[PDB]
Amino acid sequence: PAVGIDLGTTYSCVGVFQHGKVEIIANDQGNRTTPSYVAFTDTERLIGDAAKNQVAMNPTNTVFDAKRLIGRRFDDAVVQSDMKHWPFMVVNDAGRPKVQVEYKGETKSFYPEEVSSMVLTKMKEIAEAYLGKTVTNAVVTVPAYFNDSQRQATKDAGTIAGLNVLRIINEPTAAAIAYGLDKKVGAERNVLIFDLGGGTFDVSILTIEDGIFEVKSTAGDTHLGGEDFDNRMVNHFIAEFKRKHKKDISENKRAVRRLRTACERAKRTLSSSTQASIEIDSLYEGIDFYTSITRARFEELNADLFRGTLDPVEKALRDAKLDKSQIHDIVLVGGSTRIPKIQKLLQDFFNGKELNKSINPDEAVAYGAAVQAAILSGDK
Ligand SMILES: Nc1ncnc2c1ncn2[C@@H]1O[C@H](COP(=O)(O)OP(=O)(O)O)[C@@H](O)[C@H]1O
Ligand SMILES: [Ca+2]
Ligand SMILES: [Ca+2]
């Protein structure tokens, strides 16, 4: 049994094509996505939810955003810029970046592909827990703009995890494969992939013909994601708590974290409901924080970030030399594309054109990866 693994910036997802359909596999916590987090404590190494859940208690030894480091050199401008936003240490080992942590009392360093191997190990175990069988063969996805060094380092992460990586394929290709846009009766198809995750915004235009997924353009923002929408909600409620209780909770890591968690949950709920409850017992000094937020307020807090996602779409179209009327298919992927206002903005931008969004947007890449894995293994 060959699996498809979406190794995302903030979440990872594993699917298997069996008996004519994709099954996206829930972890032992019942979650169909797993945080791309690894934590190092005085006793153990944690991966996924367990790692993310203890981040506020152990910030310096909790590693994330390994995908931003993978296949890069220490001196790279992107690495030096990104280090300013991480509580964990990034050190230079002979021109290569390593994350340095405390683990079982000792100072330890790990290459990005070692951190990612631990996430892939977790995704491997999630598939094996469900299938009741050893999982070796996998297709793993990377962004279209990833170079050979980034692709090789991602593949090596799989190998370190004991996975046989059949192929590294582009995330926008996986999304297009999921919706079967390569198997439509016709000539070429122009496809725009609108991919908004937790940390990154990726716009891709492919022209698909004779099984060739030609990248015509890429655009977006490597630092725009769902976490920015969460940030706007947290600042909103910190100001609110300040007004009501004359308490600034900003420098209480635990308090801010629990507010952030509640804010992300509320955001997810606002994609299906016009209102959401914030319910935190003893947020700060035993003071309960029970309030609500309307969809309207959430949209208002994030108005500039939401409509700003259309500028990269325009750029991608210009660089691809296509009018919006020449796009055959629009594909929503990444967890953030569930936000109704984002969906409305993109559909309005494409003058009413229906969006491909029937596949759970945060599962579509793993879905495509799993289809490709079955094809390569000869089980489809
Ligand atoms: N129903 C939802 N409504 C709004 N945002 C959501 C929803 N489900 C997930 N998200 C957001 O999607 C982001 C994760 O996107 P995903 O593609 O799964 O991860 P990655 O960041 O690794 O690409 C998070 O910010 C999460 O809060
Ligand atoms: Ca950001
Ligand atoms: Ca994603």
Short mmCIF file of C-alpha atoms and ligand atoms in Angstrom, two decimals:
data_model
loop_
_atom_site.label_atom_id
_atom_site.label_comp_id
_atom_site.label_asym_id
_atom_site.label_seq_id
_atom_site.Cartn_x
_atom_site.Cartn_y
_atom_site.Cartn_z
CA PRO A 1 0.00 0.00 0.00
CA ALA A 2 1.54 3.31 -1.31
CA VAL A 3 0.38 6.58 0.40
CA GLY A 4 0.28 10.30 -0.56
CA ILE A 5 1.83 12.68 2.06
CA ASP A 6 1.22 16.48 2.03
CA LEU A 7 4.26 17.71 4.08
CA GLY A 8 2.86 21.23 4.72
CA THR A 9 4.46 24.29 6.44
CA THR A 10 2.19 24.05 9.58
CA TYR A 11 0.11 20.82 8.97
CA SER A 12 0.78 17.43 7.29
CA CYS A 13 -1.85 15.07 5.74
CA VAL A 14 -1.62 11.38 4.56
CA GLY A 15 -4.05 9.66 2.11
CA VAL A 16 -4.32 6.14 0.57
CA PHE A 17 -6.12 5.19 -2.70
CA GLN A 18 -7.82 1.80 -2.01
CA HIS A 19 -10.77 0.08 -3.84
CA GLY A 20 -11.47 3.02 -6.23
CA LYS A 21 -11.43 5.97 -3.73
CA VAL A 22 -9.04 8.10 -1.56
CA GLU A 23 -9.19 7.70 2.27
CA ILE A 24 -7.62 10.66 4.18
CA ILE A 25 -6.32 8.94 7.37
CA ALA A 26 -7.19 10.35 10.86
CA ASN A 27 -4.36 10.28 13.50
CA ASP A 28 -4.89 8.62 16.97
CA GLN A 29 -6.47 12.00 18.10
CA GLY A 30 -9.10 11.60 15.28
CA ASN A 31 -7.51 14.52 13.29
CA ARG A 32 -7.19 14.22 9.43
CA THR A 33 -4.30 16.80 9.61
CA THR A 34 -1.23 16.69 11.97
CA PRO A 35 0.80 19.78 13.07
CA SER A 36 4.29 19.88 11.39
CA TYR A 37 5.74 20.34 14.95
CA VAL A 38 8.50 18.42 16.86
CA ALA A 39 9.23 19.10 20.59
CA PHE A 40 12.28 18.08 22.74
CA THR A 41 11.77 17.80 26.57
CA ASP A 42 13.89 16.54 29.55
CA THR A 43 12.36 13.00 29.00
CA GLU A 44 10.97 12.56 25.41
CA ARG A 45 10.67 13.80 21.77
CA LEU A 46 7.04 14.75 20.76
CA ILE A 47 5.65 14.99 17.15
CA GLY A 48 2.35 16.53 15.90
CA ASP A 49 -0.44 17.63 18.33
CA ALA A 50 1.58 16.57 21.48
CA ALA A 51 4.46 18.91 20.35
CA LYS A 52 2.19 21.90 19.40
CA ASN A 53 0.08 21.47 22.63
CA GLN A 54 3.17 22.10 24.91
CA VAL A 55 4.73 24.94 22.77
CA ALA A 56 3.98 27.74 25.36
CA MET A 57 5.62 25.68 28.21
CA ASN A 58 8.72 24.75 26.06
CA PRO A 59 9.01 27.43 23.29
CA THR A 60 12.84 27.25 22.69
CA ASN A 61 12.83 23.38 22.26
CA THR A 62 9.61 23.23 20.08
CA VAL A 63 10.57 23.27 16.34
CA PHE A 64 8.23 24.27 13.42
CA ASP A 65 8.61 25.88 9.92
CA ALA A 66 11.31 23.24 9.05
CA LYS A 67 9.90 23.55 5.45
CA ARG A 68 11.23 27.20 5.38
CA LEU A 69 14.80 25.82 6.11
CA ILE A 70 14.74 22.50 4.12
CA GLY A 71 17.30 22.36 1.23
CA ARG A 72 18.73 25.87 2.03
CA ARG A 73 22.15 27.22 3.23
CA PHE A 74 22.60 29.20 6.54
CA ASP A 75 23.77 32.37 4.66
CA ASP A 76 20.62 32.39 2.38
CA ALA A 77 18.79 35.78 2.77
CA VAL A 78 15.40 33.99 3.41
CA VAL A 79 16.95 31.92 6.31
CA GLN A 80 18.53 35.03 8.01
CA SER A 81 15.19 36.95 7.66
CA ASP A 82 13.06 33.98 8.97
CA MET A 83 15.28 33.27 12.08
CA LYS A 84 14.06 36.66 13.51
CA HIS A 85 10.52 35.10 13.93
CA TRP A 86 11.52 31.73 15.60
CA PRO A 87 12.00 31.20 19.38
CA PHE A 88 14.26 28.15 18.61
CA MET A 89 17.98 28.61 17.68
CA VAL A 90 19.26 28.15 14.06
CA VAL A 91 23.11 27.65 13.95
CA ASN A 92 25.65 27.34 11.05
CA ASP A 93 27.28 23.86 10.63
CA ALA A 94 29.70 24.25 7.63
CA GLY A 95 27.30 26.53 5.64
CA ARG A 96 24.21 24.34 6.43
CA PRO A 97 21.43 25.46 8.83
CA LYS A 98 20.67 23.27 11.93
CA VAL A 99 18.00 23.85 14.66
CA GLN A 100 19.72 23.68 18.12
CA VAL A 101 17.61 22.52 21.16
CA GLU A 102 17.90 21.01 24.70
CA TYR A 103 16.94 17.26 24.70
CA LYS A 104 17.29 14.89 27.75
CA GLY A 105 19.63 17.50 29.41
CA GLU A 106 22.05 17.72 26.38
CA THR A 107 22.44 20.43 23.65
CA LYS A 108 21.48 18.76 20.28
CA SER A 109 21.36 20.09 16.65
CA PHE A 110 19.15 18.74 13.78
CA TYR A 111 19.21 19.39 9.98
CA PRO A 112 15.82 20.57 8.56
CA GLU A 113 15.34 17.19 6.73
CA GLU A 114 15.91 15.42 10.14
CA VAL A 115 13.04 17.52 11.71
CA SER A 116 10.83 16.82 8.61
CA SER A 117 11.80 13.06 8.80
CA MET A 118 10.24 13.01 12.35
CA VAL A 119 6.97 14.53 10.94
CA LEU A 120 7.06 11.98 8.02
CA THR A 121 7.74 9.18 10.63
CA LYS A 122 4.50 10.33 12.41
CA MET A 123 2.53 10.36 9.06
CA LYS A 124 3.97 6.85 8.25
CA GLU A 125 2.80 5.61 11.73
CA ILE A 126 -0.70 7.24 11.22
CA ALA A 127 -1.14 5.25 7.92
CA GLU A 128 0.17 1.98 9.56
CA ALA A 129 -2.19 2.45 12.60
CA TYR A 130 -5.18 2.69 10.15
CA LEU A 131 -4.09 0.10 7.50
CA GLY A 132 -2.76 -2.50 10.04
CA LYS A 133 0.14 -3.08 7.57
CA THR A 134 3.76 -1.80 7.05
CA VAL A 135 3.79 1.42 4.90
CA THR A 136 7.01 2.02 2.84
CA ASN A 137 6.06 3.49 -0.61
CA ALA A 138 4.96 7.19 -0.69
CA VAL A 139 4.55 10.21 -3.01
CA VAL A 140 5.52 13.42 -1.07
CA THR A 141 4.48 16.91 -2.36
CA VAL A 142 6.54 20.19 -2.48
CA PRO A 143 5.70 23.74 -3.68
CA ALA A 144 6.13 24.23 -7.50
CA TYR A 145 8.95 26.81 -6.86
CA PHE A 146 11.05 24.34 -4.73
CA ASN A 147 14.51 23.86 -6.40
CA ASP A 148 16.42 20.50 -6.66
CA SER A 149 18.21 21.09 -3.27
CA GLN A 150 14.76 21.58 -1.57
CA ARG A 151 13.30 18.52 -3.46
CA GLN A 152 16.37 16.33 -2.59
CA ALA A 153 16.24 17.39 1.14
CA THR A 154 12.45 16.59 1.26
CA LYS A 155 13.15 13.15 -0.39
CA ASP A 156 16.04 12.54 2.12
CA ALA A 157 13.56 13.37 4.99
CA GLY A 158 11.36 10.52 3.62
CA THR A 159 14.37 8.12 3.35
CA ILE A 160 15.47 9.00 6.97
CA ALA A 161 11.82 8.16 8.02
CA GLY A 162 12.17 4.71 6.30
CA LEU A 163 9.80 5.76 3.45
CA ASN A 164 10.64 4.75 -0.17
CA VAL A 165 9.79 8.10 -1.92
CA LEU A 166 8.55 6.97 -5.40
CA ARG A 167 8.42 10.64 -6.57
CA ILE A 168 8.43 14.27 -5.27
CA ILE A 169 5.50 16.00 -7.14
CA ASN A 170 4.36 19.68 -7.13
CA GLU A 171 1.49 20.60 -4.70
CA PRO A 172 -0.46 22.38 -7.52
CA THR A 173 -0.04 19.22 -9.73
CA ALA A 174 -1.43 17.04 -6.83
CA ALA A 175 -4.44 19.46 -6.49
CA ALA A 176 -5.12 19.27 -10.30
CA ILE A 177 -4.75 15.41 -10.25
CA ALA A 178 -7.26 15.25 -7.29
CA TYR A 179 -9.96 17.00 -9.45
CA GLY A 180 -8.92 14.89 -12.52
CA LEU A 181 -8.18 18.07 -14.58
CA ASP A 182 -5.50 16.12 -16.61
CA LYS A 183 -8.13 13.50 -17.75
CA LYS A 184 -10.80 15.84 -19.32
CA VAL A 185 -11.88 15.15 -22.98
CA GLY A 186 -10.27 18.14 -24.82
CA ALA A 187 -6.92 19.86 -25.63
CA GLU A 188 -5.01 22.08 -23.08
CA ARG A 189 -6.66 23.27 -19.80
CA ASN A 190 -5.50 26.48 -17.99
CA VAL A 191 -5.80 25.87 -14.19
CA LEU A 192 -5.33 28.45 -11.36
CA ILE A 193 -4.45 26.83 -7.97
CA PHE A 194 -5.32 29.23 -5.08
CA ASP A 195 -3.49 27.64 -2.07
CA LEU A 196 -3.87 29.49 1.31
CA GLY A 197 -2.57 27.43 4.29
CA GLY A 198 -1.58 28.32 7.89
CA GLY A 199 1.69 30.17 7.04
CA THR A 200 1.89 30.57 3.21
CA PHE A 201 -0.18 31.79 0.19
CA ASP A 202 0.68 30.01 -3.13
CA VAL A 203 -0.94 30.98 -6.49
CA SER A 204 0.01 28.66 -9.44
CA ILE A 205 -1.22 28.70 -13.09
CA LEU A 206 -0.73 25.32 -14.91
CA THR A 207 -1.52 24.54 -18.58
CA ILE A 208 -2.24 20.75 -18.63
CA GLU A 209 -2.00 18.88 -22.01
CA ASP A 210 -0.83 15.30 -22.93
CA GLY A 211 -0.11 14.63 -19.19
CA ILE A 212 2.29 17.67 -19.03
CA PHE A 213 1.62 20.02 -16.02
CA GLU A 214 3.39 23.16 -17.40
CA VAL A 215 3.89 25.86 -14.67
CA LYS A 216 2.99 29.10 -16.59
CA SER A 217 3.35 31.34 -13.45
CA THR A 218 3.68 31.28 -9.62
CA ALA A 219 2.82 34.19 -7.24
CA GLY A 220 1.53 34.83 -3.67
CA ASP A 221 3.08 35.63 -0.24
CA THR A 222 5.39 33.15 1.62
CA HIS A 223 4.38 34.88 4.95
CA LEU A 224 0.54 35.23 4.49
CA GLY A 225 -1.57 32.41 6.05
CA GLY A 226 -4.37 31.45 8.50
CA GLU A 227 -2.08 32.28 11.50
CA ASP A 228 -2.18 36.01 10.44
CA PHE A 229 -6.04 35.88 10.72
CA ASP A 230 -5.58 34.22 14.19
CA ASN A 231 -3.07 37.01 15.15
CA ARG A 232 -5.68 39.75 14.29
CA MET A 233 -8.26 37.87 16.49
CA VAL A 234 -5.75 37.56 19.44
CA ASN A 235 -4.88 41.34 19.37
CA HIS A 236 -8.68 42.04 19.23
CA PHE A 237 -9.34 39.94 22.42
CA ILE A 238 -6.13 41.11 24.27
CA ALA A 239 -7.41 44.74 23.86
CA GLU A 240 -10.91 43.56 25.01
CA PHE A 241 -9.49 41.77 28.14
CA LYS A 242 -7.38 44.94 28.85
CA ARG A 243 -10.53 47.19 28.75
CA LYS A 244 -12.68 44.84 30.94
CA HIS A 245 -10.13 43.63 33.59
CA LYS A 246 -7.33 46.33 33.34
CA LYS A 247 -4.91 43.37 32.70
CA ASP A 248 -2.36 43.11 29.80
CA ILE A 249 -1.97 39.30 29.20
CA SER A 250 0.55 39.88 26.30
CA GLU A 251 3.69 38.67 28.23
CA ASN A 252 1.91 35.59 29.77
CA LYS A 253 2.95 32.99 27.09
CA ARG A 254 0.40 30.41 28.46
CA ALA A 255 -2.55 32.93 28.48
CA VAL A 256 -1.82 34.24 24.90
CA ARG A 257 -1.38 30.61 23.61
CA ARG A 258 -4.77 29.41 25.04
CA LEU A 259 -6.43 32.60 23.62
CA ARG A 260 -4.69 31.87 20.23
CA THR A 261 -5.97 28.21 20.30
CA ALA A 262 -9.56 29.43 21.10
CA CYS A 263 -9.21 32.07 18.26
CA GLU A 264 -8.19 29.41 15.64
CA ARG A 265 -11.15 27.17 16.77
CA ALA A 266 -13.58 30.19 16.56
CA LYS A 267 -12.19 31.03 13.04
CA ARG A 268 -12.81 27.40 11.83
CA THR A 269 -16.40 27.54 13.29
CA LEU A 270 -17.03 30.93 11.49
CA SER A 271 -16.56 29.09 8.10
CA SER A 272 -19.83 27.10 8.81
CA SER A 273 -21.62 29.49 11.30
CA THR A 274 -22.29 33.31 11.43
CA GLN A 275 -21.11 33.33 15.14
CA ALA A 276 -18.66 31.44 17.45
CA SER A 277 -18.20 31.25 21.29
CA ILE A 278 -14.80 31.84 23.03
CA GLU A 279 -14.79 29.68 26.24
CA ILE A 280 -11.56 29.81 28.36
CA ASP A 281 -11.62 28.88 32.10
CA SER A 282 -9.00 30.83 34.17
CA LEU A 283 -7.37 32.55 31.11
CA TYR A 284 -5.37 34.90 33.44
CA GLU A 285 -5.20 35.00 37.32
CA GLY A 286 -8.25 32.65 37.58
CA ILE A 287 -10.37 35.15 35.50
CA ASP A 288 -12.65 33.27 33.00
CA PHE A 289 -12.88 34.67 29.41
CA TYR A 290 -16.34 33.78 27.96
CA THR A 291 -17.33 35.94 24.93
CA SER A 292 -18.33 35.53 21.23
CA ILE A 293 -17.37 36.87 17.75
CA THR A 294 -19.63 37.26 14.64
CA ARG A 295 -18.41 36.28 11.12
CA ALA A 296 -18.84 40.03 10.21
CA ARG A 297 -16.31 41.07 12.96
CA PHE A 298 -13.82 38.29 11.92
CA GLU A 299 -14.09 39.52 8.26
CA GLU A 300 -13.70 43.21 9.40
CA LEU A 301 -10.52 42.37 11.46
CA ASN A 302 -9.00 40.70 8.32
CA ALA A 303 -10.61 42.80 5.49
CA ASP A 304 -7.24 44.07 4.04
CA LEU A 305 -5.51 40.60 4.21
CA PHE A 306 -8.50 38.84 2.48
CA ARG A 307 -8.92 41.16 -0.60
CA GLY A 308 -5.06 41.49 -0.81
CA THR A 309 -4.91 37.78 -1.92
CA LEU A 310 -6.34 38.92 -5.35
CA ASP A 311 -3.20 41.04 -6.25
CA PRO A 312 -1.06 37.84 -6.53
CA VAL A 313 -3.87 36.27 -8.72
CA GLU A 314 -3.64 39.31 -11.11
CA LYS A 315 0.23 39.03 -11.13
CA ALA A 316 0.05 35.24 -11.93
CA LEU A 317 -2.46 35.92 -14.80
CA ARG A 318 -0.23 38.74 -16.27
CA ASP A 319 2.99 36.59 -16.02
CA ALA A 320 1.09 33.59 -17.58
CA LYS A 321 -0.21 35.97 -20.36
CA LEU A 322 -3.84 34.79 -19.76
CA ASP A 323 -7.12 36.76 -19.29
CA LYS A 324 -9.34 35.53 -16.38
CA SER A 325 -11.82 34.26 -19.10
CA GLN A 326 -9.05 31.86 -20.40
CA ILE A 327 -8.86 29.96 -17.02
CA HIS A 328 -10.74 26.60 -17.50
CA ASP A 329 -10.59 25.53 -13.79
CA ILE A 330 -10.14 27.37 -10.43
CA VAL A 331 -9.05 25.12 -7.48
CA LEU A 332 -9.31 26.11 -3.76
CA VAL A 333 -6.73 24.23 -1.60
CA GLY A 334 -5.23 24.91 1.87
CA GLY A 335 -7.33 25.08 5.08
CA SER A 336 -7.84 28.91 4.86
CA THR A 337 -9.81 28.65 1.52
CA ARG A 338 -12.76 27.30 3.64
CA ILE A 339 -13.31 30.99 4.76
CA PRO A 340 -16.54 32.04 2.91
CA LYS A 341 -15.31 35.69 2.35
CA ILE A 342 -12.11 34.40 0.58
CA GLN A 343 -14.33 32.08 -1.58
CA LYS A 344 -16.69 35.04 -2.40
CA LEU A 345 -13.75 37.41 -3.27
CA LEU A 346 -12.15 34.85 -5.70
CA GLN A 347 -15.53 33.86 -7.33
CA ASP A 348 -16.43 37.62 -7.72
CA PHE A 349 -12.88 38.28 -9.15
CA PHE A 350 -13.66 35.50 -11.75
CA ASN A 351 -17.05 37.20 -12.50
CA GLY A 352 -19.23 34.39 -11.01
CA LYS A 353 -17.24 31.31 -12.27
CA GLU A 354 -17.84 28.20 -10.04
CA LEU A 355 -14.81 27.08 -7.90
CA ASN A 356 -13.55 23.45 -7.53
CA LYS A 357 -13.88 23.14 -3.68
CA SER A 358 -15.85 19.81 -3.17
CA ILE A 359 -12.62 18.11 -1.86
CA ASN A 360 -11.76 19.29 1.72
CA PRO A 361 -9.25 22.05 0.73
CA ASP A 362 -6.67 21.02 3.44
CA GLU A 363 -6.84 17.37 2.11
CA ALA A 364 -6.77 17.99 -1.72
CA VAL A 365 -2.90 17.84 -2.05
CA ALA A 366 -2.69 14.55 -0.02
CA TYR A 367 -5.71 13.33 -2.12
CA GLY A 368 -3.75 13.98 -5.39
CA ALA A 369 -0.50 12.56 -3.90
CA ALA A 370 -2.39 9.32 -2.93
CA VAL A 371 -3.90 8.99 -6.49
CA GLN A 372 -0.36 9.47 -7.97
CA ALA A 373 1.11 6.90 -5.46
CA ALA A 374 -1.49 4.25 -6.53
CA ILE A 375 -0.68 4.95 -10.25
CA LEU A 376 3.15 4.61 -9.70
CA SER A 377 2.73 1.40 -7.55
CA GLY A 378 0.30 -0.04 -10.20
CA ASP A 379 -2.78 -0.17 -7.85
CA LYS A 380 -4.72 2.25 -10.18
N1 LIG B 1 -12.76 25.55 8.52
C1 LIG B 1 -11.72 26.38 8.48
N2 LIG B 1 -11.96 27.71 8.36
C2 LIG B 1 -10.91 28.55 8.34
N3 LIG B 1 -9.62 28.28 8.43
C3 LIG B 1 -9.41 26.95 8.56
C4 LIG B 1 -10.38 25.97 8.59
N4 LIG B 1 -9.79 24.72 8.72
C5 LIG B 1 -8.50 24.97 8.78
N5 LIG B 1 -8.20 26.30 8.67
C6 LIG B 1 -6.88 26.92 8.72
O1 LIG B 1 -6.07 26.39 7.71
C7 LIG B 1 -4.68 26.55 8.09
C8 LIG B 1 -3.93 25.27 7.80
O2 LIG B 1 -3.91 25.03 6.37
P1 LIG B 1 -3.30 23.63 5.88
O3 LIG B 1 -3.26 23.61 4.39
O4 LIG B 1 -4.02 22.51 6.57
O5 LIG B 1 -1.82 23.72 6.47
P2 LIG B 1 -0.40 24.30 5.96
O6 LIG B 1 -0.24 25.62 6.66
O7 LIG B 1 0.64 23.29 6.40
O8 LIG B 1 -0.49 24.42 4.47
C9 LIG B 1 -4.71 27.00 9.56
O9 LIG B 1 -4.50 28.40 9.69
C10 LIG B 1 -6.12 26.64 10.01
O10 LIG B 1 -6.60 27.44 11.07
CA CA B 2 2.48 35.66 8.60
CA CA B 3 -1.59 23.19 2.95
#
